[PDB]
């Protein structure tokens, strides 16, 4: 239900 | 009803079985004596579910733990009964002013020596290397004893001033641990030195040492009373004597009190009380058990008087005298696991003495770590001391790596389930390991421990791979760095765009999804709950599919395809095709999902912002929103995918404290009215959009600029957060 983008 | 009793396998369980038979004769209630392996570990696991034994036998040091967990029924002996036993034995089984077990016997390690091979045993440890030379000349060795249990090496460690917990104010200080002081380092270094110079072997365990001694192959051993029975049988002319001194100081063995506890869940507490008080704890019963395997210096005075004459018991008590009684506090188990590993790694040379004892010192006072380790022990009983990636400088001192340890296990999988063999990575650090606010805010038993989860990863094993690769650890460190920087917790179903091959090879696996670990069960610690989120490598297309639709669906689709995961969702870095290229029809189902239910994505963390054309609550007539391309590509999803369904959508900036919640008409909790669409409580901004405005918006190369009479939107291409304070 949640997104995390380009964390690295 | 019934009586089930658990006692350790090196103890006199047959004599106890005889006592149980007498109880059956007289009372008619059957008594089953069992000696399962690692009973001290299993009991707290099973007792909570109510399938533990009626009685549990062990040294007192565990019982305070059990007692703290409400696993032990309070024992209620009258004064008359209490008079038969020594007060200090009762003291040993006393916890927070309550009696949690019946004391059976005093135990202490002694030096056992072969009189024929060695008529005059050494008074000092320093003598032994020289002695080993003499004995080796004639094909013998000086000393062999169990090196796999810290119980046996502790007397040497403790000799020059090592200690478990500092006894102060009538109480134990959980912050002051004495395993990495000079004396401990000295003792352990000496042990390791004995091993280095080939006077002992690092792998030596109980049965090996016992065999060696009983066959006259080694002149000395270190053991407790229970061992004598087998020696007696060996007809070796042996003596039991005081342990050797080290640096002019006596070996200080931890004195243990063999005790019997009653399961809190047992419906036969009365039967148990009857059996324990009126059958076991008598001269004849205790004599029977002692006949089988010597108990040592029993707690019962009447039998104590009879057995004290024995110089073996006298020696036991001399060593007992020179030692200290074990604490029974709940943390002891953490202490024992910590020291066990250090002794093993130090002896094997896997770690230096200093590194090992520093690690043990830190780890003993670390409940969350101990708790996670517990779950790991449950999952992998076969691998007590797994290879670990350890950060040289810990994050609390601002080492680069927020994960203190990463454990690597070999998981054999299941060939019947057609789940291949793989490496299982488990992280330590995202949760609260220590609870002293060195990294995390201490929140208590309720709520999440640290961020409330740890990362796991399952990597396809190559047949040529002898050991697990370490790069996934760095991958996890990267992930953790993000979590700490952004303050964003991970949940099952979330996705992670990496845009790089995870192993940095030519692999097409450039992205990650997160799901519940298929084996690791969540754990309760004094610092909160820890769940375990497994990482699943995916392709860009699959990520896009997860974004456009939902994580759970894509995950299941990935489960149905074995080479892409299977039931346990293992990651294969050499995988060359997406599931959509492998099974075209599947695509149809994503398209089946999006069309009927839409998107699952409540919100996303990305580069974004908003502004006027900081502090306070404000309503705004005009608004100016800013996105990156990546987050920008989700705007169509934000509108059609969720707003149309009376749902909200939230963009959060990782860089700032900025946030934007898109809202439709018909939502609840919203302060945004149709009359006053745009309002903010600070960096948090809510804008209410009408489906009308949604469709026109939907219908409508950077910077790419969108504009309206009430609002402007651009797409375009400073601050560091540390720890979880
Ligand atoms: O080695 C760790 C272990 O130490 C003690 O265990 C002793 C036990 O007390 C004796 O009865 C005998 O069985 O030797 C054991 C060592 O193998 C502690 O009692 C125990 O809590 C701890 O894990
Ligand atoms: Zn800090």
Author numbering:
A (entry chain G): 120 to 127
B (entry chain C): 6 to 618, 625 to 711, 719 to 735, 746 to 753
Provide the authors' own sentences about this structure as they appear in the paper.
SUFU is an essential intracellular negative regulator of mammalian Hedgehog signalling and acts by binding and modulating the activity of GLI transcription factors. Hedgehog signalling plays a fundamental role in the control of metazoan development, cell proliferation and differentiation, as highlighted by the fact that its deregulation is associated with the development of many human tumours. It is demonstrated that GLI binding is associated with major conformational changes in SUFU, including an intrinsically disordered loop that is also crucial for pathway activation.
In order to determine how SUFU interacts with GLI transcription factors, we attempted to co-crystallize MBP-SUFU-FL and MBP-SUFU-Δ with GLI1p as well as corresponding peptides from human GLI2 (GLI2p; residues 267–283) and GLI3 (GLI3p; residues 328–344). Despite extensive screening, these attempts were unsuccessful. Therefore, the residues WLG61–63 of SUFU were mutated to DSF in MBP-SUFU-Δ to disrupt crystal contacts between a loop within the SUFU N-terminal domain and residues in the C-terminal domain previously implicated in GLI binding. Furthermore, another flexible loop in SUFU was shortened and residues 216 and 220 in the MBP moiety were mutated to histidine in order to promote metal ion-mediated crystallization of the fusion protein. Peptide modelled into this density forms a β-strand clamped between the two domains, creating one continuous 13-strand β-sheet spanning both domains. HDX protection analysis and SAXS experiments confirmed that this protein/peptide conformation occurs in solution and is not a crystallization artifact. Upon GLI binding, SUFU undergoes a large conformational change in which the N- and C-terminal domains come together to clamp highly conserved GLI residues in the middle of a large β-sheet. In contrast, the structures of our SUFU–GLI peptide complexes show that both the N- and C-terminal halves of SUFU interact simultaneously with a major evolutionarily conserved SUFU-binding motif, including the amino acids SYGH, within the N-­terminal half of GLI. Moreover, the tight packing of the leucine next to the histidine in GLI with SUFU residues, coupled with the importance of this leucine in the protection of SUFU from deuteration, strongly suggest that the minimal SUFU binding motif in GLI encompasses the amino acids SYGHL. The mutation of Tyr147, Asp159 or Glu376 in MBP-SUFU-FL abolished detectable binding to GLI1p in the microscale thermophoresis assay (data not shown).
